[PDB]
Amino acid sequence: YHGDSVASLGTQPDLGSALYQENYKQMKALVNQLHERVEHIKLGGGEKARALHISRGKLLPRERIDNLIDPGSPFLELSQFAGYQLYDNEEVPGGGIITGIGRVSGVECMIIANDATVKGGAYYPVTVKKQLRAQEIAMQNRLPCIYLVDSGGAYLPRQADVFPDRDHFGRTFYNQAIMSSKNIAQIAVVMGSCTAGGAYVPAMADENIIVRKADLHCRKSGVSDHWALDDHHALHLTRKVVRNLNYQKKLDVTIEPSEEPLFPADELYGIVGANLKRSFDVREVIARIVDGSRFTEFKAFYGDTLVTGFARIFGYPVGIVGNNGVLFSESAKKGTHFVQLCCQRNIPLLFLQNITGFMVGREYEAEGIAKDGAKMVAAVACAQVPKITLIIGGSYGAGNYGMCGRAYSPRFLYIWPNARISVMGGEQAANVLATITKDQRAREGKQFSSADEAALKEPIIKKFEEEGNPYYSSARVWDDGIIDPADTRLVLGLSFSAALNAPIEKTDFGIFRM
Amino acid sequence: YHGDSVASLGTQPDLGSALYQENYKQMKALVNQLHERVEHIKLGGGEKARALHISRGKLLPRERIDNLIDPGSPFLELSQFAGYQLYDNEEVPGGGIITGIGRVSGVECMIIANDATVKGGAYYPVTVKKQLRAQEIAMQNRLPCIYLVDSGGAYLPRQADVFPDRDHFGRTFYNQAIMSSKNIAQIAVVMGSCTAGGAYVPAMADENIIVRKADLHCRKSGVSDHWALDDHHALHLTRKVVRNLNYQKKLDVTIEPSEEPLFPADELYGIVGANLKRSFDVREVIARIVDGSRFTEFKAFYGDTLVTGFARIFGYPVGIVGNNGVLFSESAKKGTHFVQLCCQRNIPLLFLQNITGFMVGREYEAEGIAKDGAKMVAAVACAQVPKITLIIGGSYGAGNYGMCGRAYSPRFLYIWPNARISVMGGEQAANVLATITKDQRAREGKQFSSADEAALKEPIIKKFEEEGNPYYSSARVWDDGIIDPADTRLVLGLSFSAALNAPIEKTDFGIFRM
Amino acid sequence: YHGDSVASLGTQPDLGSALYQENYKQMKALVNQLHERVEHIKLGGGEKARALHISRGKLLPRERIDNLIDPGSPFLELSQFAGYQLYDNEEVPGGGIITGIGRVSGVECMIIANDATVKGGAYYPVTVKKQLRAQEIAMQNRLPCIYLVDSGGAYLPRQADVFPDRDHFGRTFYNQAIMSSKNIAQIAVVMGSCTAGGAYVPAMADENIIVRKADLHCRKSGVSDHWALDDHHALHLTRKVVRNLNYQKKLDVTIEPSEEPLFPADELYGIVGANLKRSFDVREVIARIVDGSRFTEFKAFYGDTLVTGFARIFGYPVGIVGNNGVLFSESAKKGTHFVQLCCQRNIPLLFLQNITGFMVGREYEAEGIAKDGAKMVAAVACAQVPKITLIIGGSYGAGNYGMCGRAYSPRFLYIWPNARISVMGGEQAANVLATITKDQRAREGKQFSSADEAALKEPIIKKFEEEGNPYYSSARVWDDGIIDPADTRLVLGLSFSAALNAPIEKTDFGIFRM
Amino acid sequence: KAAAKESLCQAALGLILKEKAMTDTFTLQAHDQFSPFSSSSGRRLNISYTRNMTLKDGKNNVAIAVTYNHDGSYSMQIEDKTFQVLGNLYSEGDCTYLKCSVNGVASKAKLIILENTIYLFSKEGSIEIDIPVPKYLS
Ligand SMILES: CC(C)=CC(=O)SCCNC(=O)CCNC(=O)[C@H](O)C(C)(C)COP(=O)(O)OP(=O)(O)OC[C@@H]1O[C@H](n2cnc3c(N)ncnc32)[C@@H](O)[C@@H]1OP(=O)(O)O
């Protein structure tokens, strides 16, 4: 029986409120800026290289993606902002590579396409990082990989950062071999010149498609498994190969009919705003994203700062954990309990981080908070269910670790355009450094002047402010993308769908330090 | 029956030869320089901080290690050169942390000790990398971890490189939790101040030892499992805890009595020298290191450039693969065959890299060499037996990948003081860049002058020369240490011994592209 | 998405061509002869024994099969030609036993029925071989076995070939026991006299049905589990027992809607003909049999002599490997690659053999061809996916091994009425023997005359010609039947359907000698 | 007479809707009935998908750029003119009927795609528009 009613979250916000108006203005401005920057990145390497690429008869990489995926299928691009102002004078749109998840012949696949326009498709260090992240995603979620190889090899002026180390270029080939061993299909499509150091990708792959115009490779080397007249033919052949994969999706979770949330998503703009100093109820966000705005809270009156419960997204079950204030002992214990419960029942986990800075409270007895957050950290680390993190606000200190940051391998991690990430708030770091130097130079009997205090403080403030920018964090691959809040639900759906390809296996826990 | 005789490798070198004299002089100079630098690093943070540390009553970290390990046991330190001239003006001896493998109570354990003298034990990015490498080694080889925590938290002026990313500070805790889940003992000894962000390490650990002089932690928090009067008492308690671990070493390989090699090891100095342009027979090295100088070569007349065979080191079986010239198709096929054979019989693998540069030969038809080296790369990547790499000469290009570089996760990787590592030789890179620019500016009709050719070439030459230095590569953690050749055998023994703690599991291979 | 179009094989043959007319005439004559011989075998032991059998009130074995299987279900009979002119003066239709696969109560089952008319149902050696082959098929494909026991025991005048050896009579009981241990149902129906040495079959079986008219067996011995009034009642009881088996078919491969081939099958008669000297494109056959004539070739321009690709038969996926000329190194490597690929994706394999004789080329450097065909042989042997072989032309030498001959345990093996199988061509063997004797008697100084050359040559030619006949090979159980080409598709469907009953398990490969 | 712009717009909409219907048919069989990937939305992160299509009218080849708007309507630009089109296929009796609004003008027809030819039968008449063969095969 599934007929009894359930209470729904969410309340209608006050559209007339001045606070709502101001928050809406600020967040809409941020989203417009994000959209403009994304368009500029989408334009690619430049009109020069684009005209040259077209004159050679080859398709532009975005056109390749459009023709490859199923007609009208949504495409989930990752890390559109890699390399954004990362290097001092060189502009590297999209990191020189395009990675995403899309449905080909009814199968979710991870597509990795080199962009020939950007520096002839050379490999900047950020490009290697992006590709490794994509391969890691595909390995974890058991997704076939399709490479659209139009490469130029390592960027020589930066070889020291691309070639030698463990997470450097060679790891790419390593991943390929491993994913072939675990029976995850590898398809390579040599749509560009087969330059030095590039033939390794087709040779490692399970199956190859090579566009006609090395010649020795198809006729004598035999590296070629298929031989295509041009780009369109190659993409069609790729679709045929994917069909011939003999794969069927196995899902192991209960499914229910999906239902839209009761409240419009754009209202989030008013609720969240751009000021981190003001706070908001995470329950509003949860009401905006989950199915039917139906939510079953767990331990509502204990550890009120954390909000944990069960819901459904597009019919899949999810356990939601979010911050609603300063994390405490009770909140940590509640989180550990909830994580154990979700792991036992094999339910995917969704974290929402809105870590609150310690500027409000001087001490907060970091020892006890640490003693309890350690338990939550261990529980999150040992979990095996799919985990997806979303940073809707500040993310500072060990709380970031506790709420499944990058170090804890969430299947995906996205940030809203108003997030901030750093070890601490800038002013707190300034005070810490000032106190350290003051105490030390007092210990040696040296005098500490207030001018020196300002001299230490100001650079730290500016540096922390600059490094906390979402664009700074997404230029490096610290997140899989910056998403417009109004689309959040949709993205999560796609992500969770992909995460369901892999089977869910049992969770083993370490010693629970009681 | 084990009585029939076996032929032994190695020949007596010509001590009177001028070439031998010169090579001996150069290599001995390199080793003396290495020893002097190691002594200076061993001195630690400085006399100032050392006196301050002693005045507080605490022991110096090296003394801690000496008292902790079994009396007279050899201690295998790793990455003594991390941070060597890595940062512009800051001297960070040993990376601010000391990691090694040593025998405690008859059990091989991985010991990680913070150095309080260096910047109060703060965590530079290189320190995080070193610690993560040590934890990875312990996880792979299933070794108990002992932490001697005297920490100061992240180095704030560099927070952006220490806190946020996947391989940044939080991964430490992640590793701890995981290694606790797989039943690998975690012991933490809080020998210093329990500052902010430090209590997480004791809280994550399985067992704790805390030196008396937080107070709340032992009496009320209950984080303390043991409470020690001072450093000596804490180390004794640690030995007792390790004994109480209830662990017994399980070995799954045949063992034979060990026998010393027939030739003195110091002769290597004459054989190898410091000039990479001259070449030498790897069989000399193999004769110098393996037991009794007994070696059973495999496919001796096919692919002569690669040398593959079986031997014993301290009684353990090893399969040895080394370069003796330019790698070719036949060499790659021989290597793939040998790797499959060793994986089938569960024998550890030892690689010796002496990759030869392509300055001698203009083309070397990189397509066929690539088509075959891909097979060897796949075979090496998919292997599951313990793999140890040693770089005795040049290491360039995809050959580094083929001979199990860092990207392919060897259990250990060491380099001799005369190695060179880079994507290509400097002059080759200069020629490549010059040709690219010349061809392009010809394409646009621009004129290319010889002055511009020199202007491009010289910086590249100097940069590649600088980046290939062993000290440059070991300052970053690209290798687990620079070893005197005269000690090589010994080191390998210890390493292999440690690698035997983990059980050897079956190897799964990808599609062998025939 | 499954909407994009695929190119189809096959071309309309030239019906007006004289070659097509002649080939059609010859092949139609062969098929008519085959049909006539099959009818004569179907007539059974003879009118004498048939009248005697009817007078006793028992049904004829073919009537038993007709009533047993589901109404209108197709029945796949195996080895209709066993014993055809095998013994000098004794005519043994069908080997004295009838074995086939048919659907009973919606379950594929292997039915084995003794023919009482032929020598009172005695067991000739060929009968034992046929029964063992049927039991092997059922064991491999996990099919319930139904025995219709009307036996007479071993044929005493030939006891030395029936009783003592491993593949002699006792192995029957062995198989029964084993197939009972692995939970494969054994049903025995004693429809004839329970003579000496026959009661073992009911006693070994899981369940019994005994026709009333030993009496002691049902009332006191208790061997009887069911007791039937006559044959019709016994068959009905058998259907009820099969229903009570509690079995459900588990399929583990993707299924698509089936579609008929685009070209009529009878055209094969014109394409193939009866002359092995002429050649034809195997792609014509593939177009005639696969679904929709859709085929996705793999490595089309490398090793053109072998044709490998993917297709669907009645909606199941199949990998097709066929000969189109003299096998070479590249062909062998392509075959090995394709076999590995199909094993990885768990796809059934279908081999088509048209091995070409070496009369065209004197040497063909057998050493290299052997060195490469060894790899293909190893790959085929180690494979675990269902394998079905079809011999559409010549089959000679080690090529037969390479294309999955009987020694390599294909689930089924059929031959067309125009095949030839032998170690070599007759003339080649004659030349080899002549050269051996000539060289030897030259070595001893004896003279070799041309009359002696003819004397050696002619008997060998005649003997090889006689032994290569399809009827000769099918008289012994070297194949599971001779099939009219026009029906080939249908047969394959049924066969593959049966092969899907067993689960497909992973393939383990030996050392790939690179 | 030569086909107008709007007829080409209707034909392009019909072909897109048939692709959507095929996607639905594949979805029905699969385990993941409610996965967002099965939607024919063409959504992208922070970008709007534009699909370049070529349709053959008589001898002439005409290129249509179809932008997949968020609302589900399609913005098709052919030459210098942009047309806002929203439509759906529903089955009247046994025949598939396309109802579609081009720039707010509602039209009703019956749509049959056989081989490479799209036939729109309406009261005004019949319009046949040919999908070009990829010609890499066939
Ligand atoms: C794995 C291991 C172990 C090792 C290796 O892999 S070692 C690989 C060595 N690489 C090559 O051997 C490829 C050399 N390229 C070429 O052969 C071509 O160039 C292509 C193929 C790139 C196509 O490019 P293209 O020819 O179509 O156009 P182009 O404009 O010429 O393309 C942009 C131009 O590339 C210049 N450029 C600068 N640095 C590099 C760089 N590192 N790689 C490529 N190009 C670079 C750029 O400065 C200029 O543009 P700019 O700066 O003047 O505006």
Ligand SMILES: CC(C)=CC(=O)SCCNC(=O)CCNC(=O)[C@H](O)C(C)(C)COP(=O)(O)OP(=O)(O)OC[C@@H]1O[C@H](n2cnc3c(N)ncnc32)[C@@H](O)[C@@H]1OP(=O)(O)O
């Ligand atoms: C996990 C997460 C998520 C977050 C975090 O973890 S956020 C952690 C914040 N850290 C602290 O809160 C510890 C603050 N230290 C102290 O409280 C003490 O200092 C000790 C404990 C370090 C003992 O050291 P000590 O007091 O015995 O000696 P001291 O000489 O003072 O030691 C050297 C001096 O440290 C200065 N120094 C500069 N930068 C740092 C730095 N980043 N950390 C520590 N010290 C630093 C150095 O400049 C000077 O020496 P110098 O450069 O003048 O020669």
Ligand SMILES: CC(C)=CC(=O)SCCNC(=O)CCNC(=O)[C@H](O)C(C)(C)COP(=O)(O)OP(=O)(O)OC[C@@H]1O[C@H](n2cnc3c(N)ncnc32)[C@@H](O)[C@@H]1OP(=O)(O)O
């Ligand atoms: C397991 C182990 C470990 C050991 C054993 O199992 S040791 C088993 C010993 N067998 C018996 O103990 C059965 C002896 N048969 C009989 O008791 C009956 O015969 C029946 C039962 C067969 C019914 O047959 P039936 O009586 O209804 O008709 P009949 O015409 O008589 O049937 C044909 C005639 O059988 C003659 N014939 C020749 N050789 C044999 C033979 N080997 N077995 C049977 N019959 C044979 C044939 O020559 C003649 O016909 P033909 O050649 O003259 O035309």
